Amino acid sequence: NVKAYELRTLKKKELLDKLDELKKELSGLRISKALGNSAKNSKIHGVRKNVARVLTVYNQKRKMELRQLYKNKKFKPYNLRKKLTKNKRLQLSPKQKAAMTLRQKKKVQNFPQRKYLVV
Amino acid sequence: VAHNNVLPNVHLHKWWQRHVRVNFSKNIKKKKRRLLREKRRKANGGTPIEKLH
Amino acid sequence: GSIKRFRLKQRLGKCRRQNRPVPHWYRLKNTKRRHWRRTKLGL
Amino acid sequence: GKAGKGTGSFGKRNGKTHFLCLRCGKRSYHLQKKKCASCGYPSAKKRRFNWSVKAKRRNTTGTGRCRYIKTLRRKLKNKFTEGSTPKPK
Amino acid sequence: KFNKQKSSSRRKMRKAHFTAPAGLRRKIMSSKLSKELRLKYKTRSLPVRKDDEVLICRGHNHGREGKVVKINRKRYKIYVERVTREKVNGESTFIGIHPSNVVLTKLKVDKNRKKILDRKA
RNA sequence: AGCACAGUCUUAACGAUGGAUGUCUUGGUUCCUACAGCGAUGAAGGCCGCAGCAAAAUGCGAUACGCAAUGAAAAUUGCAGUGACUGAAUCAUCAGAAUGCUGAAUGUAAACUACACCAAUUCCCUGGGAAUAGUGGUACUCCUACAGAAA
RNA sequence: UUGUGUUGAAGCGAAAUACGUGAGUUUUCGUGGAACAUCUCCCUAGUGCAGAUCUUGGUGGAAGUAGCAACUAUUCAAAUGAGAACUUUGAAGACUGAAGUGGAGAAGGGUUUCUUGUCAACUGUGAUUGAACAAGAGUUAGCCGCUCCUAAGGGAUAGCU
RNA sequence: ACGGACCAAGGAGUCUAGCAAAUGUGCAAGUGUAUAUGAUUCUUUAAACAUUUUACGCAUAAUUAAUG
RNA sequence: UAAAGCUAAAUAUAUGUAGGAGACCGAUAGCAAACAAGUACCGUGAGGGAAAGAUGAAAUAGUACUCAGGAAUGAGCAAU
RNA sequence: GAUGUUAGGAGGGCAAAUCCGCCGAAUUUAAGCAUAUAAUUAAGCGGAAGAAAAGAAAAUAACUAUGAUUCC
C-alpha cells in the first residue's frame, strides 16, 4: 500500500516496471478469487487502488513533460491549449474591443469625463 | 342583457390569461433602484449624478 | 430465433443479468423483476 | 372462414417493423423505410414538437447522466483560471 | 434570526440535519464540558472521541460514568463501556445515549485537539 | 351428568377483512431575489461496462460507487479487511490527470461489433533498445495565405 | 383575549334523570399515546351531501350455485415420501397410424436448456412433478451460414426549385 | 315513468374587469394621492410612514352634425 | 433632410441553476411522481402512464426456551 | 475562375421561460351564416443574447413650441 509523495520522485522506467508487476499481482489475485478460494479477496481493492495512484502520478508527470517540450511557440496542440467555453474562445479580445480610432481617442483625451463638486 | 344597466363594453373577448401580469414587486423594485442609484453616486467620488437641464 | 445479432445477444445477456434477484445480506441493512413468459421484453 | 378479422388475423403477427434506433435507444426505428419515429436517425434534428408536452419533458435535457454540463456547472462561482492549482502546504 | 441570508425554515433545515455529511455531524456530536474543565480550558464544550471519559446525567442510566468505546454518526449515538444490556438472544451490546445527555469529565489530549483548543483560546 | 325445534330478524357485549377519521412530514405549489448557454478542444441523449461477497437507484469511465491535491481531519464496517497515535479510514472543495462505444458523427454503411486507403505506431534510455495488426489521419461547405495548369 | 395538556389531549365505539325546537353543544365509560379551543370581538375560505348509469377504495345477496364436457381408456403391484386417481419403475390393455403430439429448420420468443435442492404463491382438483422458486453449469468452424454481387427498390452526390 | 345492491372519502353559483343600485364610513366644491420620489424602516418590513405655493381621472354647465 | 451603419440604462422571464420566504396543500390533497418516477406496465407507433409514507425511545430491545406437530403455526409456567 | 488528406480558422446539433422573422388555421361569437370575430393567436420552420429588439428624426405639433430609443 504505497502512497503518492513516495512515488512522486521515482524514475519513469522503475515506475512502469512497478506498475507492470502490480498488474501481474492483481491478475494472480483475480485467479485466486475466481478459483474455489475465498480467502484473499480483501487485498484486491488495495491493489486496484495502488495501480490507480501509480497511473495518476505517471500521467501527471507525462503531462508536465509534454507541456515543457512545447514552451511558447504560439502553436500549442489543441488539447494542451485553453479549454474555456466556445464563445469565450471566440469572444472579442479585451484589447480588440477597447481599440478605437485616433479621431475619437484624441477627442476623449482632449475632453475627458471629469470630476467636480458644487457649492 | 338585463333591463336598466349600461351596455356592456368588456374588451376581454380574446385570450387574456396568456397576457395577465400583476406587479407584486413594486416596493422591492423601488428599494433595488434606490440601492443601485446610491451605489452609483457613492462610487463617483461624491460628484452628483444629476445633470443640469 | 437461432440467428441473432451481436448487440441483440449482448442485450439479452444484460436483461438476464437484470433478472437476478436481490442478494440476501444486503437485505440485512425487489419489485422490477420480469418473468420469461409473463412479460415480453420486446427487444 | 379461419383467418378472420379477429383471432385469425391476430395469429399472423411475425416479422416486426421497428428496432433499436441507435441514436434514441427506444424501439421506434421503422425498418421498411430506414427512418426512426422518435428522432429520425437518418435526419439531423431531434424531431421535437410543441403539441406534445410529454414528448418534450420526458426527453428534455437534465434527464441523462450529464457528463460535461454538470461538471462545467458550479465552476462559474470559482471563476478560476484553468491550469492553476491550489497552493501546497 | 436576524440575517436573511441563513434560512430559518423548519423543513429546509431539518432536512439538512438528517442528510448532513459526517464531516458536519462531527460538529453536532458534541456535549457539555464539566465545571472544573470549563474554567481550566476557558471553553464551554467540545466534541466526543472514542477514548474519552464521560459522565452520564440524563435518562434511565444517569448514575454511572465510564470511558466511551465507539461512536456512530449514522445513528447519532455514543457508547460507554459499562452500561451494556443483553438482548433476547443472549448477546450483550452497549446501549446508545445521545450526547446531549452526557458531560465530559476527562478527555484525551491529542496533537489534533491541541490546535482546536488553541483556536478556542 | 342434565337442559335446550331449527331457520329469519332485531338489540347489547366481545372479535374478524377494510384502512377513513384524528395526528405526523427529508414532499409539493406559489411568490421574491441573484446569475446564466453547451458544442469538431467531440455537445445533450443513448448503449456498454464498474464493487470481495453487488440486483435497482445514486455515483463512476478500463485510474470505472472512485485517483491526485486543499481543508476537516479518526473511523469505515452487514461479514471480511483497511486505518494514526496524521498527504493515510471517512467527509466537504475539486482547478491537476483520465474521461470506453456512440451520438451534428465526420473515410465508405448499418438489424453488420462490416471494409477500405495514407503515414507503420508507440514506449524506454539520453544515438541505441524494446514492443505491438495495436495508433493517428481521410465528410461537405466556406475565408485568408501557397502551388503547378488555362487564354 | 385566556387556558387545557403523561394524573393522557385530538379522534373513535357505547351511552347520558343533560340542554335546545334544531341544526348541534356539553358529558360518563372503554380504547388511545401527543397535541388541543376560544362563543371575548373580528378577518378569511378549495367549508357542511343520499342521490348526478358521480369517481376512487372496500363488502354483500345471487352462491358452496352455474360450472370444471371436444381430441375413444385406462387397470394392477411396487418404490418415493407422513401424505399418491393425475411423480417414478414393472406388468397389461390401447392410441397417434408416417398429411403423426417423429425427426430437423425459418420468423418470433430469450435461458424456458442441463444438474443439484426446492413447495411461500402458481401449475383453476390433489400434488413429492413442473415451462414455478433457489444455486451452479452450458453454445468452440479456413470448409454450416452471414459477411460478396446484383432486382423490383431505398438513401445520398451535381444541378434545379 | 327514469337513477338508486351496499358503505367511507372527494363532489358543484367561485374569481377577475367594468357599471349600476342598497347600505356604512371620511372628506366635501372638491375629491383620490398614480406611476414615482426620502428615510440611522430595512428578521417580521413584498408594510407602515411621508409628498416645497395648477399631473391627471371623476365633478363643478349644457347644448348642436359643425365653425362654435 | 430618406433610400448606409453602430450603442449601456430605464424594461421580461410558465427555462435551467442557487438561495429566501408564505393567513397555500397535508398522502384520493399537493406537480403525474413525499417511496426504486417519467419507474413498472400497455400499444408494432406516434404515444399513453399508474399504486405504494407512519413498529418502536432504543430493534446496539425485531420474538430466545419448553411442549405439540413435517413444517407451517399454536400453547405455556417461558420470554422483549 | 478551376485543382488540392496544401498551412492557418470557421459553420453543422442540443437546449427556449423572456426575445427575433416567415408561414399560417380552425373551434367559437354574431343566438343562423358568408364581411367580421377568434388572431396578425394556436401549430410548423429558421436564429441569438443575459437580456434581445428599438434607437440619434425625411419626428411631433401649430403653440411664449417640444426634441434619440425604451418602459410605468
Short mmCIF file of N, CA and C in Angstrom, two decimals, chain A residues 13-99:
data_model
loop_
_atom_site.label_atom_id
_atom_site.label_comp_id
_atom_site.label_asym_id
_atom_site.label_seq_id
_atom_site.Cartn_x
_atom_site.Cartn_y
_atom_site.Cartn_z
N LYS A 13 11.10 4.63 -15.75
CA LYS A 13 11.25 3.21 -16.06
C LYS A 13 10.90 2.34 -14.86
N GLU A 14 11.40 2.72 -13.68
CA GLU A 14 11.07 1.98 -12.46
C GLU A 14 9.58 2.08 -12.16
N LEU A 15 8.98 3.24 -12.42
CA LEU A 15 7.55 3.40 -12.21
C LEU A 15 6.76 2.45 -13.11
N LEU A 16 7.16 2.36 -14.38
CA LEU A 16 6.46 1.47 -15.30
C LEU A 16 6.62 0.01 -14.88
N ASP A 17 7.83 -0.37 -14.46
CA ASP A 17 8.04 -1.75 -14.02
C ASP A 17 7.22 -2.06 -12.77
N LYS A 18 7.15 -1.10 -11.84
CA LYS A 18 6.33 -1.26 -10.65
C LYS A 18 4.87 -1.46 -11.04
N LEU A 19 4.39 -0.67 -12.00
CA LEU A 19 3.02 -0.82 -12.46
C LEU A 19 2.79 -2.19 -13.08
N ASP A 20 3.74 -2.66 -13.89
CA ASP A 20 3.58 -3.96 -14.53
C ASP A 20 3.52 -5.08 -13.50
N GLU A 21 4.41 -5.05 -12.51
CA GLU A 21 4.40 -6.12 -11.51
C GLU A 21 3.16 -6.03 -10.62
N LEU A 22 2.67 -4.82 -10.35
CA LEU A 22 1.42 -4.69 -9.61
C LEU A 22 0.26 -5.28 -10.41
N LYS A 23 0.23 -5.03 -11.72
CA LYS A 23 -0.82 -5.62 -12.54
C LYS A 23 -0.73 -7.14 -12.53
N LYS A 24 0.48 -7.69 -12.58
CA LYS A 24 0.63 -9.14 -12.52
C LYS A 24 0.12 -9.70 -11.20
N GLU A 25 0.45 -9.02 -10.09
CA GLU A 25 -0.02 -9.47 -8.79
C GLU A 25 -1.55 -9.40 -8.71
N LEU A 26 -2.14 -8.34 -9.25
CA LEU A 26 -3.59 -8.22 -9.26
C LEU A 26 -4.22 -9.33 -10.09
N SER A 27 -3.60 -9.67 -11.22
CA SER A 27 -4.10 -10.77 -12.03
C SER A 27 -4.06 -12.08 -11.25
N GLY A 28 -2.96 -12.32 -10.52
CA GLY A 28 -2.89 -13.51 -9.70
C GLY A 28 -3.97 -13.56 -8.64
N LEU A 29 -4.24 -12.41 -8.00
CA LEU A 29 -5.31 -12.36 -7.00
C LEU A 29 -6.67 -12.62 -7.64
N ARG A 30 -6.87 -12.14 -8.87
CA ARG A 30 -8.10 -12.47 -9.59
C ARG A 30 -8.20 -13.96 -9.85
N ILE A 31 -7.09 -14.61 -10.20
CA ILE A 31 -7.10 -16.06 -10.37
C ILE A 31 -7.54 -16.73 -9.08
N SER A 32 -6.99 -16.28 -7.96
CA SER A 32 -7.33 -16.86 -6.67
C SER A 32 -8.82 -16.69 -6.37
N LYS A 33 -9.35 -15.49 -6.60
CA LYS A 33 -10.77 -15.27 -6.35
C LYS A 33 -11.64 -16.14 -7.24
N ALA A 34 -11.29 -16.24 -8.52
CA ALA A 34 -12.11 -16.99 -9.46
C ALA A 34 -12.14 -18.47 -9.10
N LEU A 35 -10.97 -19.04 -8.79
CA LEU A 35 -10.93 -20.43 -8.37
C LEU A 35 -11.60 -20.56 -7.00
N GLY A 36 -11.83 -21.80 -6.58
CA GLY A 36 -12.59 -22.09 -5.38
C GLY A 36 -12.17 -21.37 -4.11
N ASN A 37 -11.04 -20.68 -4.14
CA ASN A 37 -10.59 -19.90 -2.99
C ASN A 37 -11.58 -18.78 -2.70
N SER A 38 -11.72 -18.46 -1.41
CA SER A 38 -12.50 -17.30 -0.98
C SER A 38 -11.83 -16.58 0.19
N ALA A 39 -10.50 -16.62 0.25
CA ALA A 39 -9.77 -16.06 1.39
C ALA A 39 -9.14 -14.71 1.08
N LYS A 40 -8.33 -14.64 0.02
CA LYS A 40 -7.53 -13.46 -0.28
C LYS A 40 -8.32 -12.35 -0.97
N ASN A 41 -9.65 -12.36 -0.84
CA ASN A 41 -10.48 -11.43 -1.59
C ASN A 41 -10.35 -9.99 -1.11
N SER A 42 -9.66 -9.75 0.01
CA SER A 42 -9.62 -8.40 0.57
C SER A 42 -8.60 -7.53 -0.14
N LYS A 43 -7.38 -8.04 -0.31
CA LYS A 43 -6.26 -7.21 -0.78
C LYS A 43 -6.48 -6.68 -2.20
N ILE A 44 -7.44 -7.25 -2.93
CA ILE A 44 -7.66 -6.85 -4.32
C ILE A 44 -8.03 -5.37 -4.43
N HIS A 45 -8.83 -4.85 -3.49
CA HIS A 45 -9.18 -3.44 -3.52
C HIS A 45 -7.95 -2.56 -3.32
N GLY A 46 -7.09 -2.94 -2.37
CA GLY A 46 -5.87 -2.19 -2.16
C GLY A 46 -4.98 -2.18 -3.38
N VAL A 47 -4.88 -3.32 -4.06
CA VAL A 47 -4.06 -3.38 -5.27
C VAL A 47 -4.67 -2.51 -6.37
N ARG A 48 -6.00 -2.58 -6.53
CA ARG A 48 -6.67 -1.80 -7.56
C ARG A 48 -6.60 -0.31 -7.28
N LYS A 49 -6.36 0.08 -6.03
CA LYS A 49 -6.14 1.48 -5.68
C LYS A 49 -4.68 1.89 -5.85
N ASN A 50 -3.76 0.97 -5.56
CA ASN A 50 -2.34 1.22 -5.80
C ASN A 50 -2.08 1.48 -7.27
N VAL A 51 -2.61 0.63 -8.15
CA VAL A 51 -2.36 0.80 -9.57
C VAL A 51 -2.94 2.12 -10.05
N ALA A 52 -4.10 2.51 -9.51
CA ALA A 52 -4.72 3.77 -9.90
C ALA A 52 -3.83 4.95 -9.54
N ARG A 53 -3.28 4.94 -8.32
CA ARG A 53 -2.41 6.04 -7.92
C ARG A 53 -1.13 6.08 -8.76
N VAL A 54 -0.55 4.91 -9.04
CA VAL A 54 0.65 4.88 -9.86
C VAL A 54 0.36 5.45 -11.24
N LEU A 55 -0.77 5.06 -11.82
CA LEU A 55 -1.14 5.59 -13.13
C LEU A 55 -1.34 7.09 -13.07
N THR A 56 -1.98 7.59 -12.00
CA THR A 56 -2.22 9.02 -11.90
C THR A 56 -0.91 9.81 -11.84
N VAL A 57 0.04 9.35 -11.02
CA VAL A 57 1.30 10.09 -10.91
C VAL A 57 2.09 10.01 -12.21
N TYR A 58 2.07 8.84 -12.87
CA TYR A 58 2.75 8.71 -14.15
C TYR A 58 2.16 9.66 -15.18
N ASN A 59 0.83 9.72 -15.25
CA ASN A 59 0.18 10.56 -16.25
C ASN A 59 0.45 12.03 -15.98
N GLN A 60 0.42 12.45 -14.71
CA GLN A 60 0.72 13.84 -14.41
C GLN A 60 2.15 14.19 -14.79
N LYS A 61 3.10 13.30 -14.49
CA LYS A 61 4.48 13.55 -14.89
C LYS A 61 4.59 13.68 -16.41
N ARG A 62 3.92 12.80 -17.14
CA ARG A 62 3.97 12.87 -18.60
C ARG A 62 3.37 14.18 -19.10
N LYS A 63 2.28 14.63 -18.48
CA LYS A 63 1.66 15.88 -18.91
C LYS A 63 2.59 17.07 -18.70
N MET A 64 3.24 17.14 -17.54
CA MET A 64 4.20 18.24 -17.34
C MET A 64 5.35 18.15 -18.33
N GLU A 65 5.84 16.94 -18.61
CA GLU A 65 6.95 16.80 -19.55
C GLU A 65 6.56 17.27 -20.95
N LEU A 66 5.38 16.85 -21.42
CA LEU A 66 4.96 17.22 -22.76
C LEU A 66 4.38 18.62 -22.84
N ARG A 67 4.17 19.29 -21.70
CA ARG A 67 3.97 20.73 -21.75
C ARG A 67 5.30 21.47 -21.79
N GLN A 68 6.29 20.96 -21.06
CA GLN A 68 7.61 21.58 -21.06
C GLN A 68 8.25 21.52 -22.44
N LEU A 69 8.01 20.42 -23.17
CA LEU A 69 8.58 20.29 -24.50
C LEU A 69 8.12 21.41 -25.43
N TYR A 70 6.95 21.98 -25.19
CA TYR A 70 6.36 22.92 -26.14
C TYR A 70 6.16 24.30 -25.53
N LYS A 71 7.19 24.83 -24.86
CA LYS A 71 7.11 26.18 -24.32
C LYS A 71 6.85 27.21 -25.41
N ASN A 72 5.87 28.07 -25.16
CA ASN A 72 5.56 29.24 -26.00
C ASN A 72 5.29 28.75 -27.42
N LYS A 73 5.98 29.27 -28.43
CA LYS A 73 5.92 28.80 -29.81
C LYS A 73 4.58 29.11 -30.48
N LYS A 74 3.62 29.62 -29.72
CA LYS A 74 2.34 30.12 -30.22
C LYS A 74 1.55 29.07 -30.99
N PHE A 75 1.97 27.82 -30.96
CA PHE A 75 1.29 26.75 -31.68
C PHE A 75 1.14 25.53 -30.80
N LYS A 76 0.66 25.75 -29.58
CA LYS A 76 0.41 24.64 -28.68
C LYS A 76 -0.66 23.72 -29.27
N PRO A 77 -0.53 22.41 -29.11
CA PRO A 77 -1.56 21.49 -29.59
C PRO A 77 -2.91 21.80 -28.95
N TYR A 78 -3.97 21.37 -29.63
CA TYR A 78 -5.32 21.79 -29.25
C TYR A 78 -5.66 21.36 -27.83
N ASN A 79 -5.32 20.12 -27.46
CA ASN A 79 -5.62 19.66 -26.11
C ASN A 79 -4.79 20.42 -25.08
N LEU A 80 -3.54 20.73 -25.40
CA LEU A 80 -2.70 21.50 -24.48
C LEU A 80 -3.07 22.97 -24.43
N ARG A 81 -3.93 23.43 -25.33
CA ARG A 81 -4.36 24.82 -25.35
C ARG A 81 -5.44 25.03 -24.29
N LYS A 82 -6.09 26.19 -24.34
CA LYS A 82 -7.13 26.50 -23.37
C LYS A 82 -8.35 25.62 -23.57
N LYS A 83 -9.10 25.42 -22.48
CA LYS A 83 -10.36 24.70 -22.52
C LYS A 83 -11.44 25.59 -21.91
N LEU A 84 -11.50 26.84 -22.35
CA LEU A 84 -12.59 27.73 -21.95
C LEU A 84 -13.83 27.36 -22.74
N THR A 85 -14.89 28.15 -22.63
CA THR A 85 -16.07 27.81 -23.40
C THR A 85 -15.91 28.29 -24.84
N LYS A 86 -16.81 27.79 -25.70
CA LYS A 86 -16.72 28.08 -27.12
C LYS A 86 -16.79 29.58 -27.38
N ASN A 87 -17.81 30.24 -26.85
CA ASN A 87 -17.93 31.67 -27.08
C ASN A 87 -16.95 32.50 -26.26
N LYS A 88 -16.32 31.92 -25.24
CA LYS A 88 -15.19 32.60 -24.61
C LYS A 88 -13.98 32.62 -25.54
N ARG A 89 -13.67 31.48 -26.16
CA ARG A 89 -12.56 31.45 -27.12
C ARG A 89 -12.86 32.33 -28.32
N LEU A 90 -14.10 32.31 -28.81
CA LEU A 90 -14.49 33.10 -29.96
C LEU A 90 -14.87 34.53 -29.59
N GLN A 91 -14.82 34.88 -28.31
CA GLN A 91 -15.14 36.23 -27.88
C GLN A 91 -14.07 37.21 -28.33
N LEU A 92 -14.48 38.46 -28.53
CA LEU A 92 -13.54 39.50 -28.88
C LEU A 92 -12.52 39.69 -27.77
N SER A 93 -11.28 39.97 -28.16
CA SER A 93 -10.25 40.24 -27.18
C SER A 93 -10.57 41.54 -26.43
N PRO A 94 -10.19 41.64 -25.16
CA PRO A 94 -10.38 42.91 -24.45
C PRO A 94 -9.67 44.07 -25.13
N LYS A 95 -8.43 43.87 -25.57
CA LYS A 95 -7.74 44.90 -26.34
C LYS A 95 -8.47 45.17 -27.65
N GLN A 96 -8.98 44.12 -28.29
CA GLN A 96 -9.68 44.30 -29.56
C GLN A 96 -10.91 45.18 -29.39
N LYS A 97 -11.70 44.96 -28.34
CA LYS A 97 -12.89 45.78 -28.16
C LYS A 97 -12.53 47.17 -27.66
N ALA A 98 -11.49 47.29 -26.83
CA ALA A 98 -11.10 48.59 -26.32
C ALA A 98 -10.38 49.42 -27.37
N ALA A 99 -9.95 48.81 -28.46
CA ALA A 99 -9.31 49.57 -29.52
C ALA A 99 -10.32 50.50 -30.19
#
